[PDB]
Each structure stands twice: as structure tokens, then as C-alpha cells.
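Input:
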Amino acid sequence: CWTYEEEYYFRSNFLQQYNKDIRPLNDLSKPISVGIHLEIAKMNDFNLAEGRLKIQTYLILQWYDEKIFWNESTYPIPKLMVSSKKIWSPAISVYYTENEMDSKDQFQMEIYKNGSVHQWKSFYFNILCDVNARAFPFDKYTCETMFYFNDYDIQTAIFSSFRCISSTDLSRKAWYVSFSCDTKIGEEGSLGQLSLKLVRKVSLQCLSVLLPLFIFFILNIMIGYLPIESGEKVTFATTVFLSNVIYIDNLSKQLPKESSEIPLIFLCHIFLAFLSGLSAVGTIITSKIILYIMTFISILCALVFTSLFFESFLD
Amino acid sequence: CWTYEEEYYFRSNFLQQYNKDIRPLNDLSKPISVGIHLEIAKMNDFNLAEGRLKIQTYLILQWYDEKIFWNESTYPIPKLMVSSKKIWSPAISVYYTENEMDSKDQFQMEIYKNGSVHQWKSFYFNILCDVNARAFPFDKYTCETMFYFNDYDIQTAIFSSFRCISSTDLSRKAWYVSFSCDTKIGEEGSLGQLSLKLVRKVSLQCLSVLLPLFIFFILNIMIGYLPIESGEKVTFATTVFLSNVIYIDNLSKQLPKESSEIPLIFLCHIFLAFLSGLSAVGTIITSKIILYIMTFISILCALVFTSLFFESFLD
Amino acid sequence: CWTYEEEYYFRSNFLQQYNKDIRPLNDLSKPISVGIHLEIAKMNDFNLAEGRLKIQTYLILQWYDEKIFWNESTYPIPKLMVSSKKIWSPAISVYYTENEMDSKDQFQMEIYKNGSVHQWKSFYFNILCDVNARAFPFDKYTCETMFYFNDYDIQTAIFSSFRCISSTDLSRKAWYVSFSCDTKIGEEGSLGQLSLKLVRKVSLQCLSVLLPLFIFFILNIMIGYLPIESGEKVTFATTVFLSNVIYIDNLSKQLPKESSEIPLIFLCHIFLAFLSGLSAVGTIITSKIILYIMTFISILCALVFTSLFFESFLD
Amino acid sequence: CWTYEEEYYFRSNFLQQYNKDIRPLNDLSKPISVGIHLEIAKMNDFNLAEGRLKIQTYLILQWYDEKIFWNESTYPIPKLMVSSKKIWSPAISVYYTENEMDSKDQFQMEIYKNGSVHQWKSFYFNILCDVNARAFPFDKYTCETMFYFNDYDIQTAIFSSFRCISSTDLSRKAWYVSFSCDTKIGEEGSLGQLSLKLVRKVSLQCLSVLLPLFIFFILNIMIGYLPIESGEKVTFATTVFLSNVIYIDNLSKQLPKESSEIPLIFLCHIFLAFLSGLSAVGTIITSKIILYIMTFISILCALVFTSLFFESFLD
Amino acid sequence: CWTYEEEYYFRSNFLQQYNKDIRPLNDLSKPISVGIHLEIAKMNDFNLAEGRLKIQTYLILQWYDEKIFWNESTYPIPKLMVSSKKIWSPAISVYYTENEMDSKDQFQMEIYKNGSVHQWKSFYFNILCDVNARAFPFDKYTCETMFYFNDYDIQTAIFSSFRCISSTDLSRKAWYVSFSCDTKIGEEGSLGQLSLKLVRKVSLQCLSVLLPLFIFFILNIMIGYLPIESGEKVTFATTVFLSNVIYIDNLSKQLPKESSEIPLIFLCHIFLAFLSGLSAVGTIITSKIILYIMTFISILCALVFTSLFFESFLD
Ligand SMILES: *[C@@H]1O[C@H](CO)[C@@H](O[C@@H]2O[C@H](CO)[C@@H](O[C@@H]3O[C@H](CO)[C@@H](O)[C@H](O)[C@@H]3O)[C@H](O)[C@H]2NC(C)=O)[C@H](O)[C@H]1NC(C)=O
Ligand SMILES: *[C@@H]1O[C@H](CO)[C@@H](O[C@@H]2O[C@H](CO)[C@@H](O[C@@H]3O[C@H](CO)[C@@H](O)[C@H](O)[C@@H]3O)[C@H](O)[C@H]2NC(C)=O)[C@H](O)[C@H]1NC(C)=O
Ligand SMILES: *[C@@H]1O[C@H](CO)[C@@H](O[C@@H]2O[C@H](CO)[C@@H](O[C@@H]3O[C@H](CO)[C@@H](O)[C@H](O)[C@@H]3O)[C@H](O)[C@H]2NC(C)=O)[C@H](O)[C@H]1NC(C)=O
Ligand SMILES: *[C@@H]1O[C@H](CO)[C@@H](O[C@@H]2O[C@H](CO)[C@@H](O[C@@H]3O[C@H](CO)[C@@H](O)[C@H](O)[C@@H]3O)[C@H](O)[C@H]2NC(C)=O)[C@H](O)[C@H]1NC(C)=O
Ligand SMILES: *[C@@H]1O[C@H](CO)[C@@H](O[C@@H]2O[C@H](CO)[C@@H](O[C@@H]3O[C@H](CO)[C@@H](O)[C@H](O)[C@@H]3O)[C@H](O)[C@H]2NC(C)=O)[C@H](O)[C@H]1NC(C)=O
Ligand SMILES: CC[N+](CC)(CC(=O)Nc1c(C)cccc1C)Cc1ccccc1
Ligand SMILES: CC[N+](CC)(CC(=O)Nc1c(C)cccc1C)Cc1ccccc1
Ligand SMILES: CC[N+](CC)(CC(=O)Nc1c(C)cccc1C)Cc1ccccc1
Ligand SMILES: CC[N+](CC)(CC(=O)Nc1c(C)cccc1C)Cc1ccccc1
Ligand SMILES: CC[N+](CC)(CC(=O)Nc1c(C)cccc1C)Cc1ccccc1
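Output:
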């Protein structure tokens, strides 16, 4: 039941010989052990096509201050909240986001009688991702980032643990999210790794991108069965060809810009456009002076590519 | 009728033994009760398609400072405005917007003779929303967020109330907005839950989504009654099929992404496309030469989808 | 002809018993009168379709400091420039933009011998607008916001005047701008109201939005006078309908998010698409088993709508 | 060869009776003369269609501090670098960008033995521009802005000079950039006027726009020299009409907004559309059963517009 | 094995006669030598079409503080981490990004017993690039930036070295990146010149602009060898030519904005069009009153352009 006056007197006289610039140890030749417990709360996913996933994480850093220990016999307080600029706290940062991460300290530290210190932090940053889009829509992403100390190497401060959990609502929207994190020993200090794996789901909206690949397909075989007596055919074919190539342009603006392998949808569209153009050329050449063969080739190639797509299919 | 000199003296000598880092209580073993009165002022709606609603709220925090009580006998001032960095105030935040909420303190606190303190705050944040598009064009959105203390748990500071009102303009902008908020007890402290539910008002701007379905329904059913003597029947069937599939492609781009269940319009149109394609395939197979039974069943399937669509109709 | 040393001596000893947190009045029970002179400098109009106009205004606040009066007999200075953080100034803000307006105090206050103080401020904020699109593309907007004190109510500080002017270059670019501003008495203090009225010009570039409609009108009535012999008519028409319904979606994207009345362009496009669909159905049923009648109906409806548009026409 | 110790001693005792809030003059009734030397380094051009050109400029302000003069007899230092918050420097700003210019001071001031002070500044601001698109694609723009003291009027501080230069790599791509600079005298003190004139280059990619102008020209002339025996002439004329109007729309989507006058190419294509439609309706009348007059009118108008276009043609 | 108390005592008494505004030299008439070691970590190339590449670099500045030398005999500390606002550090900046680079000092400095000081910095800035489009899609970019001291010239501070390395993952993604950096001597002090060269990799996705040309080429050369007896030849030529105009319009939207040369592919296409259209004209006009000649010229010039492209062809 500590009253205001004694908490005031304590706060006046509990950092007497304390310098927040010095790691709180009785022997400074050894590292200070900091534990981390991380929770991935949300993902943005806006620029995931360009290779950047904007995620938010919550950290609970825990360490031991060996200079701010007291006992209730003299100060009947079991714990306190102390601002971040009054005592030593470690500065953490993640690779490739130093300049685009505001890092405003707003959560005070919580310090116990025996020196245990807990600090709350939240990071909102881009984690770069590598895209495997051979099967599209069902692209797969792998992401990685490393947390490190802003000022301390392995001989000055070390991550004693690194655990990650999830809010259970990461994978609720069009992603299978699987994470793993553990502490590594980097060249310039102790690092905490964080690896994410995102696998797109089978949403109807994502599969709508297949319909164009259907349309042209129909239109393609639909050049064959037309008024061959009329020259309209060649013109019609040309028209289709144009549309197809234009669509490919628009298509390239959606595909993950840089995949480990070329997506099969693009190859199918290229094949269809090439076949339509050659069909127009062939019909006009015949008019100057194959059907079943063209249909057989189309069927063979399309079935091979669809079989590959089924092979790479996920559920 | 306090003059400038006596208010100057009071301001000089009214925080003598006061530390703003300490909750203003005479017994600190119990939580400080903070009451909140909230008003949802505006909505953005821009990114509601992605699943984020950007709202602005005005908060009136009210608590009791037990160390700044005075009486008019010695200080003829009934109330004062004192800056946010002179006396203790609680820092509030909302889930999932810690790192994208500027939180600039610009309104001073108002303190009465007996310690009653009122503070004004304004938050402008993204409240994540979940979309149900079963009845699209009309969609339903549910949004939720929680307010919490940056620094205090249930044993150090508690929300004694949580009330919300509106500006009477949220309803006007093409949305039925209904909200409900109350104080909860979370795992890590007292929380203020705020829940929003947005339905979409009826607009004549949804003939854009009704007309195509009606016209395509009529065209599709009219394929049965044609100059069946003419082979053009299969031509009409194919052209209608392509038109339907192109419409599917266009439509799928204006449905919400994270839809809980597939919208009914999509099912109606995709089934109509299936029907027309089956009709064309049957016509061509007959020309070159179970189908009828399936078509008969299909019409019933469309009747089922249309009944579900009308059952979910709003006003 | 005051020298550096006497201005130095003055600046050292002219805020002796002054607290910038107190209103500079000899009797603090009465309000402090602050006069405002505003000027709308520029408009953005980028997001005006979404219902937000971004304007920049210049303010000249003028009040009387009843505690910093001096006379040239002792200090040969007629006036001074004193930084904003040395003497009391009122904090002003506007509705619905508290969280997205960066308060950078960069202009010093100008204080005369008799206490008159002038301060320069510049605000850059969104002002929400209500749209009327009954006549489109010649849409009309009404916008409105209020200025208020951050920290003072009617019994503490009051706007003694509120006057606005314009830079004369507001209406030079595709808008007729009319403004009006006066001081009101709000529930929570004195308010300064600012009302804008924007009316779009007749820019011939804007008129191209009517060009697509004309394309269809032609194609539409260009369905009857064709090689009807070729049942394909049905097909051409179905193409037309598809095109119209793919346009209408983009147009709905273009239209103002919400209008007090439904724009006529949308209704006309809906009618044209409907007529095209019925034309297809009619040719189909006729082939299973009007031209001049269809033309008369189209002419009547179009003339009625254009007559309503001309009735609503302004300038 | 001044050592560390004597520079330390100098820095300690060279602002003894110096207030940075007072203009450094021995007679403060007269203005302080500040000289400016500006260099336009880069332009952004991204929003130049909307009328905003984002430019970066480097300023070297020069003035004379009459209170920080010393001689090497007592302080063997010829010049020093002193931070911006130790001595008086003038605050400069530009019109219509006060709220969207960071204005971070990062370059120290260079002060010589006799008081001459040089300061570096870099502005990155939008400068509103007026577009003249009569000649398209060779559109031309004019921009202007003014620099002014944040805190001083003509009787307290004046610009003694205002010179400008370019970066020598400014007009090297797609623009003929010209500049002018002079010291005006407004109602709120001395002003520094900066005027820019941008003229688009003759990049052959832009000349691609002229290809359609000839195509649709060829097509209109071509309508007459065809198998007029076939009534299809109506169909072909309607086709060129529809294509021309569709183009007109697409091009209008490219023309700059708020243009001073309607571009010539727009009128050319409008008249070509009119000619095509007139020919189509004339052929329809012929089928129902002025030609040479229409051809003469069209040739005259098109040749007049082309002569004009080529008259303004640059290079 | 230094304990907390002696490090506290050291930090209290190791900046006794130190001014962080003074370069840490014993003879200040000579420059202070600062070494740099740079690493381009990532690049964004989102706006690379506009000519701006956004790269992130990591710097390790190294210099010698001649005033903070101590020895272990009195202070058993071999090195220390000291904040950036306790001792002198140089301010570095790069050309043309002063106003769009946050520059937050977050990494402390590491100082050794003998005065060697290291500092960590990270810059995230745009580096302007020049585009060569002669080989399309295999465009080549050249970029350059210059690092300099915010406050020091060649007689006050100098870059003793300037070395750059790479993270080895720059070129992993659709770019050949080759850097080079060395120190220069500019007119405003020592400079660090950084040069980049980007050359797009030869993918298959970047070979979908080959097919549209090739096919078109054939089509264009297939206008001559046709059933010339059939007058429809001219109609097919108009169809292909309209396709050509549409494809030219599409392609003009993909080229880099400001290329030094004229993209060869764009040339090929536009020239093929103009000459084929002239051939069709020639045919119709002559009938109103060459084929092989136009085919020969088209082949000659198209092959000349293709060879000109193959010349610079990369892999
Ligand atoms: C320093 O003091 C702190 C708190 O005074 C100690 O931490 C607390 O230690 C107790 C056990 O001594 C923990 O109790 C256990 O908590 C878990 C919750 O995960 C619960 O499941 C168990 O049934 C049990 O109640 C308590 O959680 C823990 N709290 C915190 C915040 O750490 C710490 O152990 C002391 N260290 C030393 C070296 O004395
Ligand atoms: C501490 O002092 C404050 C103000 O001096 C007290 O708050 C005020 O309490 C009075 C009643 O004592 C309230 O009067 C009532 O106001 C309501 C408005 O809802 C009105 O409908 C009633 O007819 C009556 O006039 C007054 O509103 C209220 N004002 C504020 C700003 O809180 C507070 O009760 C005092 N606390 C204690 C423990 O004495
Ligand atoms: C306190 O002192 C200030 C400045 O000495 C007084 O304001 C000034 O008052 C004079 C007249 O007393 C004004 O002169 C007039 O100015 C207008 C411009 O609007 C001009 O058109 C007239 O011909 C005449 O010259 C002067 O403008 C005005 N200046 C300012 C900045 O307010 C103020 O009246 C004094 N107040 C008291 C209570 O004595
Ligand atoms: C106060 O002292 C400063 C520097 O100590 C003087 O500025 C410098 O003045 C000298 C002449 O006294 C200038 O020398 C000339 O420089 C030009 C460069 O344009 C050169 O072409 C000539 O051959 C000659 O060397 C020097 O440039 C100039 N430097 C600067 C940075 O301004 C200033 O004149 C003194 N003022 C008074 C009132 O004594
Ligand atoms: C001032 O003290 C610092 C550190 O005490 C000295 O820097 C260090 O100097 C030693 C040699 O005296 C270097 O050792 C060598 O390091 C290289 C790594 O490149 C290694 O390959 C060699 O086998 C050898 O171990 C050490 O690297 C170096 N460290 C740093 C961070 O620079 C510095 O030389 C002293 N200055 C003077 C003037 O004595
Ligand atoms: C949900 C409360 N939340 C977010 C509002 C995060 C939090 O404690 N989750 C958490 C963590 C971080 C680790 C393990 C287990 C759990 C449940 C509080 C918070 C913590 C640090 C910084 C900011 C907020
Ligand atoms: C409209 C005035 N307004 C916004 C300009 C908000 C305000 O009082 N509404 C309100 C609240 C917040 C609670 C209950 C009842 C009402 C009417 C003032 C304000 C309050 C807090 C923070 C910022 C501004
Ligand atoms: C044009 C000079 N200008 C803008 C550059 C604005 C200014 O005085 N016009 C003004 C105002 C604000 C009210 C009434 C009458 C007039 C002429 C100076 C300025 C004023 C306040 C803040 C920033 C700049
Ligand atoms: C190129 C060096 N540069 C830009 C990196 C600008 C500079 O000296 N050009 C300059 C100026 C500003 C006026 C007249 C003549 C010249 C050559 C240095 C700089 C100057 C001021 C502010 C920031 C940087
Ligand atoms: C990978 C660690 N990293 C980035 C996390 C960069 C780093 O040491 N690479 C580096 C440099 C900068 C120069 C030479 C050799 C190497 C390996 C540390 C770092 C350095 C400066 C600023 C911030 C972080």
C-alpha cells in the first residue's frame, strides 16, 4: 500500500549513481543477455508482387538490470513503470529498413524489484520476399529478415532467445503463412532470424485471371470453323492476335515482376498468340494458292502445360 | 475575478510536490479509473475494398487527479487549462495502428478545483474490416478495434466506462453504419472494444449489376427458340457464351477480395455461361451427328440461385 | 535609431513577470478577443471526386497583449518580432483535419508598443464536400469547415471577427469558386465558419466524357439499318450490349462517389444498354416467329432527358 | 596554425553579448541586406500535366554580421564554421509551399574574420505552372514563384541581389528550360521573383501522335476511290467515323488540363470526324435515292489547321 | 575486467576540455582525413522508367580523434560506444537528395583507446539515371551520385579513401549491376563519386515484343504475294494497318520516358506501318488513275534496322 509520497521519494533516489549510457552490469567485459518474444500481428500484402511484404510485429524484450535492484523493506513497491529515457535499454533494428522505420518509443519499461526489465516495442517494416511463380496464381513466397543491435556486438550484448508466435489471423485471408525464427551468430553481432513462407490460396478472384487464357483458347479454335470462303477469317484472326498481344502487356504488369522461374500462364498466352498469328498467315498464304495438324498441335501443347500445372497444383 | 498576478502565482505554486510520472492517487495499490467518451466523426471508405476502413474519432478522457485539488478561498480560480506535459495523463492506443498514428498532443487538459481532469484526443486510424459479399451489389462489413493503455494493466489503471456516439453524418454517405462499444478485460489490461457494421444502401447505381444478368438470362433462354433449321443457332450460342465469359472476367475485378462466401451474382452468371456453353456444344455435336437431362436440371439450378439472391435482397 | 545594445537590454527585461501559458489579460474572467483575416490561396481538387478538396489558407491573427505594453520614452523601439514560443498565442485548428495537418510554427509574432500582436499562419487541409451530379459532367460541390480554439471556450476566448478574401486566381482554372465566412457560436466555443461553393466550368476537354455515349447511340441505332438478312445482327448487337456494360462499370468508377441526385449520363447509358439488349431479344424472337417505333421511342426518351438537362443548365 | 585549445577558447568567448534573435546591425532602424545566389538543380516533371513542377534549388545566402567581427592578432583563425542555432540567420520561404516543405537546417554557416557570413540552403518545392497546349505535342509551360523573408518587411530586411544559374544538365532532356530572376518589392517586403519557361522537345516518340492524323486523313480521302457500286461505302464511312471518334476520345484523355486554349490537333481530328460523318450521311441519302463542296470545305479547313500547326512547329 | 563504477567515472571525465563543434585535430590548419567504406545493399528500380533508381547503402566512416586518446593503465577500457551527440562526427550528404533523406543518427560511434573512431550510417536515396533505349527491351542505364561534407571544404576535411562493395544479391534479380567509386576533387571540397551501370537481363518474358514484330513483319511482307486478283487484298491491308496503329499506340506506353537514342523496335514498327500504308495508298490511287518495289524497300530497311539492333544485341 505504497502512498504517493514514498513512490515520489523513491523515484527521486533510485537512479543515484546510474548512467543510462552504460550497460547495466557489474562486470562489463561480458555480454548482456537480452531475450526477445515476437508476435507477427498483421501483413499488408499490397506490394507483394514487387517482392515486399509489409508486416507488423510486437516485441517484448526482457533483460536484467543489475544496478536497479531494491527490496520492499525500504521501498514498499513491487514494480514500477519507468520511461524509456531514464534507464538503459537496447536499440534493435532489422535489415534493409533502417531508414523507413519510424521507431518512436512510446511504451514505458516495467522494472521489478530484482532488476527484471520488460520493454514493449512494435515494428512496422517491409520484409523482402523471393517469388517462385512457375505456377500462377499459386505462387509461393519465401521471406527473411534479421534483427540486430544498433550498438553492440557479440562480445557486448547477445540475444539469449528468439521466439515467434502468430495472432492466429495471419492465414485467415488468402495466404498459408508459416514462420520460423531462431538466433544466429552473425559476423558483426548476435542476430535474430525471422523467416516467413507464404503460399497463395485458391480464391475465386485469383482464379479469374485464368478466364482470359480461356477466352483466347476458344477464340483460337474458333478461327478454324468460319466462312473460309470469305476472307473475313484472316482479318478476324489478325484482330484476335492483336488483342492477345495487348493482353500480354497488361498481363506482364500483374505477374510477380521477378520469379525464380517463368510462369506457365505467360507461356500459354505466348503460344496462343503465336499460333493465332501463324494461322492468319497460313490462311492468307493458302488463299494465295493443316487444319487437323494445327488442332493436334494445340491439343498436345495445351494438355502438356495443363498437366504440368496439375503437377504443381496445391490442393 | 482572478487577476493576472494571482493566476501567475498559482501556476508557480500548484505543482510543488508533484511528479507527472506517478499516477495521481493517494494509494497506488489500486487502479486509477479513466472514463472515455468517444465520437466517430468521419470515414474514408477509400480502401474498404482491400479490407481497411480509415475512421476519425474524438475522445474525451475524464479522470480525477487526487493531488491537484484546491479551493477558491486561497486561489480564486474555478478551473484551469494546463499543458499535457505538466501533469499525469494516460497514453491510449489502438490495436494494429501503433506505428501509423502520429499522436501529436496539442489539446491542453482542463482541471477543476476538486481534481476533475478532462482531456481531448483525436485518433485517425485504420480499423481492419471483414467483408461478406453474398448479397453483392450489397455487401456487409464488420470492423473491430480495441483501445488500451500504453503503460498500465488492470491492476494499475482501468476503464471505468466506454461510450460512443456519432455525428449523424456516417449514415448519410451510402452506408448503414451501426456501432457498439464497451469495456472488456483483456489478458494484458483493460480494453475498450469498438465494433462497426457497415451495410451498403440501395442505389439505382446497381442497375449496372442487374441489367447484365437480366439481359443475359433472356438471351440464354431464347437460344432454345431459334431458326433451328439455320445452323446460326450454334453461332448465337457461342457468341452468347463468349459474351458471358467476358462479362465474368470483367465482373470478377469488382468483387471484394477477402469475401467470406462467394457472391451470388458471380454464381448466377458463371452458371449461365456454363448453360450457354453446354447448349453450343450440344448443338455442334448434333450437327456433326444425357445432354437434355442436364440442361433441364440446370434451369432448376438457376432457379435455386435466383431464389437465394432474392432471399438475401435488402429492402 | 535604437542600437543593438538597447534592443538586447530590452529583449532581456520585457518578459519579467510574464507566463506564456496565461491569457494576457488583466481580468481573466472575460474572454480574449482574437480577430482573424483569412485568404484562400490555392486549391488542389485532385480527390474532389472522392469528396475532399485540399485548400491552402493564410491567416493573420490579431489580438492585444495587455502585459507587454511599453513606451518609447524608455525603450526607443516602435515594434518587435518575437518568436512564437516566448509570448502567449492561441492555437487554432479546423474540424476533421486535426491529425493530418503539421503544426509548424515558423513565423514570428509582431508586437507593437501598445500590445497589438499580429501572427501569421498557413493551413493546408482537406475540406469535405457534398456533390450534386444531376447534371454531369457539370457537377457542383459545396464544402464547409469550422475553425476553433484548441484550448478555449466561449467564456475564455472568442473570435471577434472572421473575414476571408481570395487570391483572384482560384476561379481561373476550371472552377467557379464562391466563398462566405462568418463567426458562429458553437456548443463548445466560438467557431469560425468557412463555406465554399465550386461549380465546374465548360472545359471542352471535359465534354469528351459525353463522346463515348455518342459512340454507343450510333452503334445502337446502327443495329437496325444493317444486313438484317444475316441473323448475325443478333450477334453484332450482343457485342454492343457487352461493350455498353463494360463501359458503364468504368463510368461508375469515374462518377462522384455519391451525389444527392443520380447523374443523367448514367441513366442514359443504362437506357441505351437496355434498348440494345431488347433489340437483340426482339430480332431473336422475330426470327423465331418495330424499326420506326424503336427510333421514335429512342428519340422521345433522349429528347426528354436532354430537355431536363437544358432546364438544369447553368451558364 | 591555430591549435585546438585557442579555437576552443575563441568559440567560448566570441558570442558574449550576442542575441541570435536580433538582426546583427549597429543601427537597427535600417534594413539588413541579404544577397542570394540560386541554382536550379533538378526538376521532377511528374505532375507537370496537373500544373505542378517539382524543382530543387540550391541557395547561397550572403550577409554581413556587424557584431561577430574579429582580427587574427588576438584570435589566429581566418574563418569558422558555426551552427545555424548560434547566430542570426534569415528564414526564407516561397509562395504556396509553406506547409509542404520540410526546411531542415543541416548546413552550418561560414563566418569570416570581418563578419561576412555565407549560408547554404536547399529547397525542394512545387512551383505552379500554366500550360499552353495550342501546339500539340509541342506544349509550352510558364511557371513563377517568389521568395520572401518569414519575419521581416522591407524596412527590416531586403534582398540586395537575386541571381540564378542552371545545372548545365537541366534542359538536356525533353525541355528547353529558360529562367529569369529579379528582386521585386511587394506589400509585405522585398520579394525575389523566379520565373521558368519550359518547352517540350521534339522527341520523335511524341511525333508518333501525328501518324493517326494522317491515317484517318488517308481513310477519309480513300472513301471516295472505292467500289462505290457497292452500298458498303456507307459501312466503311461509318467505320472510319467510329474509329475517328474513338480516337478523339482517347487523345482527349492525353491533352493537358486547364490549357490556355483548345489544341489544334483536337480541332483537326474533330473536323476529320465531321467530314467522315458528312460523307456517311450523304452516302446513306444516296442509298435512299454537295460531295465536291464537302471535299473542298474539308480540304480547306484541314490545310489551314496544318499550316497553322506547322507555323508553330518548333525546330 | 572494468566494473560499472570505473566506466561511470571514465564517461564522466573523458570529455573535459572537448568541444564537439571543433574538428578533433591538434593543428586545425590541415584537413581531417575521413575514410569511407560503402556497400550497396538493395535497389528498388520501381521508377527506373522515369530515370530514378532508389538504392540503400551502408557506410562505415573511419577517422582519428586526436583528443580522446587514453590508455588502459588509468582506464581499463579498450574501447567504448559513445553517442553521436557527445563527440565530433562529420555530416555527409549526397547530391540531389538533401530534402528527401531523413538522416536520423541512430548508431552510436565506437572509439578505441588510441582515438580511432568508427561510425555506422545508412542512406536510402534516389540516384538519377540516364536511359539508352537503342536495344529494346535490353535497355541500359547509367547512374551517378556524389558524397560530400555538409560543412567542410578541401582545406578543412578530406576523404582519404572511398571503397564500395556489393551484397552479391543486387544482380540476382533481372539486372547486371556493375559499380565503381573513387574520390574526386570538386570545386566545393573533396567528393566521393559513385557510379552504377544497369543492363537488363535477357529473359523470355522480355521477348514477347519480338513476336508482335515478327508476325507483323510477315503480314506486312505478305501484302504483296496474295490473290491480287481479289480486290479484298486492300481490305486486308487496311485491317492489318489498323492493327499496326493500335499496336504502335500500345507500344508507345512502354518505352522509357527520356531515352538518349530512338528505340530501334519502335522505329521498325512505325516505319513498317507508314510504308505499308503508303503501298496500299499507291494501289488504290493507281487504280483510280509498285507492289514488288514496296516489298523490296520494306525488306531492305527492316533488315537494316534489325541488323542495327543485332549490333548492340546483348547475349
Ligand atoms: C525477478 O522477479 C520476477 C517477478 O517478481 C520473477 O518473474 C516471475 O517469476 C515467477 C516465479 O518466481 C513467475 O511465476 C510463474 O508465472 C507463470 C506465468 O508464465 C505461471 O505459469 C506460473 O504458474 C508461475 O505463476 C512469474 O510468471 C514471473 N513473472 C515475470 C514477469 O517474470 C523473476 O523470476 C525474478 N527473477 C529472479 C532471478 O529472482
Ligand atoms: C468536481 O467539480 C466538478 C466541476 O466543478 C463537478 O462536475 C460538475 O458537477 C456538477 C454537479 O456537482 C454538474 O452539474 C450538473 O451537470 C449536468 C450536466 O450533465 C446537468 O444536467 C445538471 O443539471 C447539473 O447542472 C456538472 O455538469 C459537472 N460538470 C463537469 C464538467 O463535470 C464534479 O462533480 C465534482 N466532483 C466531486 C467529487 O465533487
Ligand atoms: C496600437 O498601435 C498600432 C500601431 O501603431 C495601431 O494600429 C495602427 O493604427 C493606425 C491608426 O491609428 C493605422 O493607420 C491607418 O492604416 C490604414 C491601413 O489599413 C491606412 O489606410 C490609414 O490611412 C491609416 O494610415 C495603422 O494601419 C494601424 N496598423 C496596424 C498594424 O494595426 C493601433 O490602432 C493601436 N491601438 C491602440 C488601441 O492605440
Ligand atoms: C571580408 O572578408 C572576406 C574574406 O576574408 C572578403 O571576401 C573576399 O574578398 C576578397 C577581396 O578582398 C576576394 O578576393 C577576390 O576573389 C575573387 C573571386 O570572385 C577573385 O576573382 C579575385 O581575384 C580576388 O581574389 C574574395 O573572393 C572574397 N571571398 C569571399 C568568400 O567573399 C570580403 O571582401 C571582406 N569584406 C570587407 C568589407 O572587407
Ligand atoms: C588504434 O587501435 C586500433 C584498435 O586497437 C587499431 O586498429 C587495429 O589495428 C590492428 C593492428 O594494430 C589490426 O590488426 C589486424 O587486423 C586485420 C584485419 O583487417 C587482420 O587481418 C590482421 O591479421 C591484424 O589482426 C586491426 O584489424 C585493427 N582494427 C581496426 C578496427 O582498425 C589501430 O591500428 C590503432 N592505430 C594506431 C595508429 O596504432
Ligand atoms: C495483443 C497485445 N499486444 C498488442 C496490442 C501484443 C502482445 O503482447 N502480444 C504477445 C506478444 C508480443 C508476445 C507473446 C504473446 C503475446 C500475446 C500488446 C503489445 C505488446 C508490445 C508492444 C505493443 C503492444
Ligand atoms: C464537434 C466538436 N469536437 C470535434 C471538433 C468533438 C466533440 O466535442 N464531440 C463530442 C465528443 C468527442 C464526445 C461526446 C459528445 C460530443 C458532441 C471537439 C473535439 C473534442 C475532442 C477532441 C478534438 C475536438
Ligand atoms: C500574399 C502574401 N501572403 C502569402 C505569401 C498572404 C497575405 O499576406 N495575404 C493576405 C492575408 C493572408 C489576409 C488578408 C489580406 C492579405 C493580402 C503572406 C503570408 C501571410 C500569412 C502567412 C504566410 C504568408
Ligand atoms: C554542386 C554543389 N552544390 C550542390 C551539391 C551546389 C553548388 O555549390 N552550386 C552553386 C550554387 C548553389 C550557386 C552558385 C554556383 C554554384 C556552383 C553544393 C550545395 C550548395 C548549397 C546547398 C547545398 C549544396
Ligand atoms: C550486414 C551488416 N550491415 C547491415 C545490417 C552492413 C555491413 O556491415 N556490411 C559491410 C559494410 C557496410 C562495409 C564493408 C563490409 C561489409 C560486410 C551492418 C551495418 C553497417 C552500417 C550501418 C548499418 C548496419
